[PDB]
Design a protein around this ligand. Structure first.
Ligand SMILES: C[C@@H]1C[C@@H]([C@H](O)CC2CC(=O)NC(=O)C2)C(=O)[C@@H](C)C1
Ligand SMILES: [Mg+2]
Ligand SMILES: [Mg+2]
Ligand SMILES: [Mg+2]
Ligand SMILES: [Mg+2]
Ligand SMILES: [Mg+2]
Ligand SMILES: [Mg+2]
Ligand SMILES: [Mg+2]
Ligand SMILES: [Mg+2]
Ligand SMILES: [Mg+2]
Ligand SMILES: [Mg+2]
Ligand SMILES: [Mg+2]
Ligand SMILES: [Mg+2]
Ligand SMILES: [Mg+2]
Ligand SMILES: [Mg+2]
Ligand SMILES: [Mg+2]
Ligand SMILES: [Mg+2]
Ligand SMILES: [Mg+2]
Ligand SMILES: [Mg+2]
Ligand SMILES: [Mg+2]
Ligand SMILES: [Mg+2]
Ligand SMILES: [Mg+2]
Ligand SMILES: [Mg+2]
Ligand SMILES: [Mg+2]
Ligand SMILES: [Mg+2]
Ligand SMILES: [Mg+2]
Ligand SMILES: [Mg+2]
Ligand SMILES: [Mg+2]
Ligand SMILES: [Mg+2]
Ligand SMILES: [Mg+2]
Ligand SMILES: [Mg+2]
Ligand SMILES: [Mg+2]
Ligand SMILES: [Mg+2]
Ligand SMILES: [Mg+2]
Ligand SMILES: [Mg+2]
Ligand SMILES: [Mg+2]
Ligand SMILES: [Mg+2]
Ligand SMILES: [Mg+2]
Ligand SMILES: [Mg+2]
Ligand SMILES: [Mg+2]
Ligand SMILES: [Mg+2]
Ligand SMILES: [Mg+2]
Ligand SMILES: [Mg+2]
Ligand SMILES: [Mg+2]
Ligand SMILES: [Mg+2]
Ligand SMILES: [Mg+2]
Ligand SMILES: [Mg+2]
Ligand SMILES: [Mg+2]
Ligand SMILES: [Mg+2]
Ligand SMILES: [Mg+2]
Ligand SMILES: [Mg+2]
Ligand SMILES: [Mg+2]
Ligand SMILES: [Mg+2]
Ligand SMILES: [Mg+2]
Ligand SMILES: [Mg+2]
Ligand SMILES: [Mg+2]
Ligand SMILES: [Mg+2]
Ligand SMILES: [Mg+2]
Ligand SMILES: [Mg+2]
Ligand SMILES: [Mg+2]
Ligand SMILES: [Mg+2]
Ligand SMILES: [Mg+2]
Ligand SMILES: [Mg+2]
Ligand SMILES: [Mg+2]
Ligand SMILES: [Mg+2]
Ligand SMILES: [Mg+2]
Ligand SMILES: [Mg+2]
Ligand SMILES: [Mg+2]
Ligand SMILES: [Mg+2]
Ligand SMILES: [Mg+2]
Ligand SMILES: [Mg+2]
Ligand SMILES: [Mg+2]
Ligand SMILES: [Mg+2]
Ligand SMILES: [Mg+2]
Ligand SMILES: [Mg+2]
Ligand SMILES: [Mg+2]
Ligand SMILES: [Mg+2]
Ligand SMILES: [Mg+2]
Ligand SMILES: [Mg+2]
Ligand SMILES: [Mg+2]
Ligand SMILES: [Mg+2]
Ligand SMILES: [Mg+2]
Ligand SMILES: [Mg+2]
Ligand SMILES: [Mg+2]
Ligand SMILES: [Mg+2]
Ligand SMILES: [Mg+2]
Ligand SMILES: [Mg+2]
Ligand SMILES: [Mg+2]
Ligand SMILES: [Mg+2]
Ligand SMILES: [Mg+2]
Ligand SMILES: [Mg+2]
Ligand SMILES: [Mg+2]
Ligand SMILES: [Mg+2]
Ligand SMILES: [Mg+2]
Ligand SMILES: [Mg+2]
Ligand SMILES: [Mg+2]
Ligand SMILES: [Mg+2]
Ligand SMILES: [Mg+2]
Ligand SMILES: [Mg+2]
Ligand SMILES: [Mg+2]
Ligand SMILES: [Mg+2]
Ligand SMILES: [Mg+2]
Ligand SMILES: [Mg+2]
Ligand SMILES: [Mg+2]
Ligand SMILES: [Mg+2]
Ligand SMILES: [Mg+2]
Ligand SMILES: [Mg+2]
Lengths: 51, 99, 105, 49
RNA sequence: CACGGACCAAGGAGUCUAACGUCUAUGCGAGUGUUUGGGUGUAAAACCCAUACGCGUAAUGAAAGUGAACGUAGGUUGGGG
RNA sequence: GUCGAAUUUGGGUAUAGGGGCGAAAGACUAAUCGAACCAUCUAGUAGCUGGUUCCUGCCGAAGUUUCCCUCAGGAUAGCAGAAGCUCGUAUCAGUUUUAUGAGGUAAAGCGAAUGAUUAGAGGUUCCGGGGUCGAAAUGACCUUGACCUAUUCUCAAACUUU
RNA sequence: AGAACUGGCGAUGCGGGAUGAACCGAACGUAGAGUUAAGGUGCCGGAAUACACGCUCAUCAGACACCACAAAAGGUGUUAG
RNA sequence: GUGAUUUCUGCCCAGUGCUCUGAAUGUCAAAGUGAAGAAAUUCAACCAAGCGCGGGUAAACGGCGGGAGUAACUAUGACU
RNA sequence: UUGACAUUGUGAAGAGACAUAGUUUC
RNA sequence: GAAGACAUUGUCAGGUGGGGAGUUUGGCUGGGGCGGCACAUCUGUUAAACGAUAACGCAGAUGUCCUAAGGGGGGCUCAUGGAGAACAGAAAUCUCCAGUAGAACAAAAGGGUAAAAGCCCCCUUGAUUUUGAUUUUCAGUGUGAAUACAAACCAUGAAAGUGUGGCCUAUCGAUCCUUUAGUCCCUCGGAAUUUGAGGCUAGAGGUGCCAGAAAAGUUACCACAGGGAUAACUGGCUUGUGGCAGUCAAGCGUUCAUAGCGACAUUGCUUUUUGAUUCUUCGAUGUCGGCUCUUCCUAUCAUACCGAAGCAGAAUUCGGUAA
């Protein structure tokens, strides 16, 4: 018979993540010279909902 | 599909054999053509003959070794004995066979 | 059935060529051997793809097998097959039938 | 319907075979409790000792 | 009270080919088959031809192999002429 | 039916055929869906259905045998035609007669064998059971059984002398 | 529904059985004359409303093989024993 | 998988599946090893996963008996 | 999925043989 | 930075793999299916006195069993019964008489058999070797089984003889391939030796759908070629079954066969029962019931006129002419 639903998922056609409104990926700072020998300061400038 | 006292036949026509029928309608034509070629070669080839001297040779196998037959060319030996090198013999309408 | 372990019968062996005593035994088999041309052709036929390439018998109906005696001339060495009717029970050991005895206990 | 799924079809709704499917199953086969090492209502306290 | 067929024209179905059995006609005959080819031509014709080859003249064995007259190529009985 | 939302809806865009898509009906995928459409392989195969085109002359069937994944089909034999060929009073015959065999059906039989079946009569017990006399009896007397003798009515595809 | 022997129908018209595959008669070139078969001869309809002895009267008579149905049982109807 | 709430959700791991820190001298491929042979080859040992053995698991698939008696009328049967 | 061979090299300790020198193998 | 000769990848090998592919999923048959086997056979009968002969006809049987239950020779006579003998009885073992087989011979049945073909004993391997001919089934193929000889070698018996499995009529198997026995024979094609392999002759391993494929289901989502050679519905033959009506008259009915009834038997009719058949229709003749509406039949429920009664009256029952 037919290809079942959970196999069709993988070709991600109608099944890809809805992404348009997202803030961007969440990530720590790239591990540079500051963060691994000292510290570096930032300001949280906005806390915000991410669809 | 088996009947009567008939001999058993083997007619191999199970492939698309009609795609591979050669009927020589061009017998007469090719003959003419073939003859014209010869008249042409003769004329081009000035006074030379249309063919080369070929050697006697005894034919192979128990069946034909009774008979003797035109060979290919003349063996480096035979030429030498006949008082000439092979490079020349070739230009004089004589076939030579190194093997 | 129970048949004798020996038997005096005809021996066809040029020198023997008479009735001589034979030792009776029961034919078996013979290991297969690849390198028989049959096994050789079969083995090739089954390589690559295509699956079983020869038939395989299933519709078994017999429940017996004709027994075959090996008869060996103690003089002239040579052997002679002879084949029995279908039977279910074959021994060629002994225990001959007895006269007219009572049933035991 | 059967075309669509291992679970499809039958004149009553039902799985017709254990829905705990092997790890080594193949695409098209893995529906239900994959690789399930137990099954049934969990009784008693969980929490990794 | 089974099926096709309202009507009319025109089209519309055992063919050709490879290899064969029986029969028959014809050529030649222990032979036979010119047409792969060559020669030649009034040019796909008609005419001519060397070497091979095919079938036949030998059979029988798995094979190695062997291989057809005792005799008026036999005796007996019927045989047309 | 529902009508402010799992709402309706345009354009753009993605997913393509053993594939998609499916709030799941085997639904939908351009009047096509339990596998779309186009061309080609392809004049696919068909033990099955239909049709198969002028005239007259002569001869003229089978539906049976055997084998077959055989039972709407084949092969085999038979029946049929054609061609003739070797001969010719000759040899021939879906017939009779005569002589000599075989047969167990129809009839018949059952006071003949096997097997069935109605009725009595006469026998026979140290011995099948009852009952009277009994201390019993291998005692006597009735009794009913079977068995026996000579009879009697009736039967047979798998009975029979004839 | 299934066998035996023969004869048929199928493959076959013709005369008869009104009608009808298989019954009766008889098998087929185109025709003239004659005679018949099976079956008929009141009229339809070719052919004696012929001859002869009986029997039969039915307010649901009867009427020709295959064949298109009738039984037990009854009658002081009538007939002959 | 089941199908709001409420309430409840029992017994069965022998079978079929799933699964495991399990055991081990049973089975078990190719290569590799040994032995015989002039070699082709033959034989043997070792031997992965798997299987077999052992354990878990039903909101996995699913399952959740039959006969005989027994109370001061009968009936019934808590009881055997 | 599991094994073998190839990609595949370098030290060290411990086993494994000509049968208690180091070439070899785990 | 992590990782490290491990992963990875490449090639073979084992496991797993309806996720997917391709395929298959007997026949006869009073439709098909379930069943049975009439599918390969045997006896008796059907079978119509040669032979042949059908049905899912009748009563049975076969896929085995036997080192003797095969082969030869001698001796003996069986089933049964009567009359006899301590314990001993219906039945133990002894003897005599009668005894045509009333027994026994693996088995189904039928044939056969008495100094045997049965029972007891003695000696045995002819249940062997070679390759042809013949009878049944038949195509005058095969297979099975069997018959009579030829050529060996044996057995038994004093011998003539007899013996080529089982007294006769059933008890079984192609081609390919494997395996074994045979002769020490042929071939491996450049020549040899040796392994190996290949031939020739005869056996075994089996096809029971038994002249001999290698084979699970489901479809109501369904498809095609056909079939009236074939079921489901009308209609046709039949009429067991269903329904209806008689004849005889033993009984019922206080008495009394027949007012009204009517056993045991027995003759029929009907075709709104159900079966049985399978002739018509499967390139289609629209199912069940109801509604509507016509007409017809009579085996008459009512209504008209009657006859009978176990008809006093009233009521009822039986019968006739009547649709
Ligand atoms: C069952 C087994 C095999 C069978 C036979 O080899 C089956 C073969 C037959 C044939 O000719 N060709 C095939 O493809 C199959 C046979 O003879 C038996 C005795 C033993
Ligand atoms: Mg994306
Ligand atoms: Mg060709
Ligand atoms: Mg082809
Ligand atoms: Mg061309
Ligand atoms: Mg030249
Ligand atoms: Mg030897
Ligand atoms: Mg599925
Ligand atoms: Mg599954
Ligand atoms: Mg289901
Ligand atoms: Mg469910
Ligand atoms: Mg038609
Ligand atoms: Mg029409
Ligand atoms: Mg025209
Ligand atoms: Mg000219
Ligand atoms: Mg030209
Ligand atoms: Mg010339
Ligand atoms: Mg020449
Ligand atoms: Mg030749
Ligand atoms: Mg030769
Ligand atoms: Mg020689
Ligand atoms: Mg003579
Ligand atoms: Mg798919
Ligand atoms: Mg496809
Ligand atoms: Mg694809
Ligand atoms: Mg559905
Ligand atoms: Mg369209
Ligand atoms: Mg559409
Ligand atoms: Mg065509
Ligand atoms: Mg077409
Ligand atoms: Mg057919
Ligand atoms: Mg004629
Ligand atoms: Mg077959
Ligand atoms: Mg037939
Ligand atoms: Mg037809
Ligand atoms: Mg008889
Ligand atoms: Mg008789
Ligand atoms: Mg009689
Ligand atoms: Mg008589
Ligand atoms: Mg009698
Ligand atoms: Mg007649
Ligand atoms: Mg016809
Ligand atoms: Mg006629
Ligand atoms: Mg007429
Ligand atoms: Mg009439
Ligand atoms: Mg009129
Ligand atoms: Mg008139
Ligand atoms: Mg007159
Ligand atoms: Mg009459
Ligand atoms: Mg009268
Ligand atoms: Mg669940
Ligand atoms: Mg729901
Ligand atoms: Mg949910
Ligand atoms: Mg509870
Ligand atoms: Mg408990
Ligand atoms: Mg369990
Ligand atoms: Mg190994
Ligand atoms: Mg269970
Ligand atoms: Mg590894
Ligand atoms: Mg690596
Ligand atoms: Mg699979
Ligand atoms: Mg499949
Ligand atoms: Mg069938
Ligand atoms: Mg069938
Ligand atoms: Mg049936
Ligand atoms: Mg059946
Ligand atoms: Mg039959
Ligand atoms: Mg058959
Ligand atoms: Mg048989
Ligand atoms: Mg037989
Ligand atoms: Mg006869
Ligand atoms: Mg016959
Ligand atoms: Mg007998
Ligand atoms: Mg005697
Ligand atoms: Mg034997
Ligand atoms: Mg044959
Ligand atoms: Mg024969
Ligand atoms: Mg005997
Ligand atoms: Mg040998
Ligand atoms: Mg050699
Ligand atoms: Mg050679
Ligand atoms: Mg060579
Ligand atoms: Mg040698
Ligand atoms: Mg050798
Ligand atoms: Mg068959
Ligand atoms: Mg057969
Ligand atoms: Mg099959
Ligand atoms: Mg299928
Ligand atoms: Mg009736
Ligand atoms: Mg009736
Ligand atoms: Mg009745
Ligand atoms: Mg009476
Ligand atoms: Mg009275
Ligand atoms: Mg009275
Ligand atoms: Mg009725
Ligand atoms: Mg019909
Ligand atoms: Mg009908
Ligand atoms: Mg129809
Ligand atoms: Mg129609
Ligand atoms: Mg219509
Ligand atoms: Mg109509
Ligand atoms: Mg009336
Ligand atoms: Mg009146
Ligand atoms: Mg009175
Ligand atoms: Mg009226
Ligand atoms: Mg009227
Ligand atoms: Mg009227």
């Amino acid at each position: 018979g037919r290809v079942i639903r959970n196999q069709r998922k993988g070709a991600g056609s109608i099944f890809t993540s809805h992404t348009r409104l997202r803030q961007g990926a969440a990530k720590l700072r790239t591990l540079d010279y500051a963060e691994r020998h000292g510290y570096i300061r930032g300001i949280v400038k906005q806390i915000v909902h991410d669809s | 599909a088996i009947s009567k006292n008939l001999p058993i036949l083997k007619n191999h026509f199970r492939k698309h054999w009609q795609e591979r029928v050669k009927v020589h309608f061009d017998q007469a034509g090719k003959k003419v053509s073939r003859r014209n070629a010869r008249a042409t070669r003769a004329a081009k080839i000035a006074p030379r003959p249309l063919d080369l001297l070929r050697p006697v040779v005894r034919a192979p196998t128990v069946k034909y070794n009774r008979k003797v037959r035109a060979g290919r060319g003349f063996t480096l030996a035979e030429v030498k004995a006949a008082g000439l090198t092979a490079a020349y013999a070739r230009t004089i309408g004589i076939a030579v066979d190194h093997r | 059935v129970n048949v004798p372990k020996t038997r005096k019968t005809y021996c066809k062996g040029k020198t023997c060529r008479k009735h001589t005593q034979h030792k009776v035994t029961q034919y078996k088999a013979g290991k297969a051997s690849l390198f028989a041309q049959g096994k050789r052709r079969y083995d090739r036929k089954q390589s690559g793809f295509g699956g079983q390439t020869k038939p395989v018998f299933h519709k078994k109906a017999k429940t017996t097998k004709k027994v075959v005696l090996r008869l060996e001339c103690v003089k002239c060495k040579t052997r002679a097959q002879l084949t029995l009717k279908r039977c279910k029970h074959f021994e060629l050991g002994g225990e001959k039938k007895q006269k007219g005895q009572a049933l035991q206990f | 319907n059967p075309v669509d799924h291992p679970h499809g079809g039958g004149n009553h709704q039902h799985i017709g075979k254990a829905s705990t499917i092997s790890r080594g199953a193949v695409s098209g086969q893995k529906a239900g409790l994959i690789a399930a090492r137990r099954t049934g209502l969990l009784r008693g306290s969980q929490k990794t000792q």
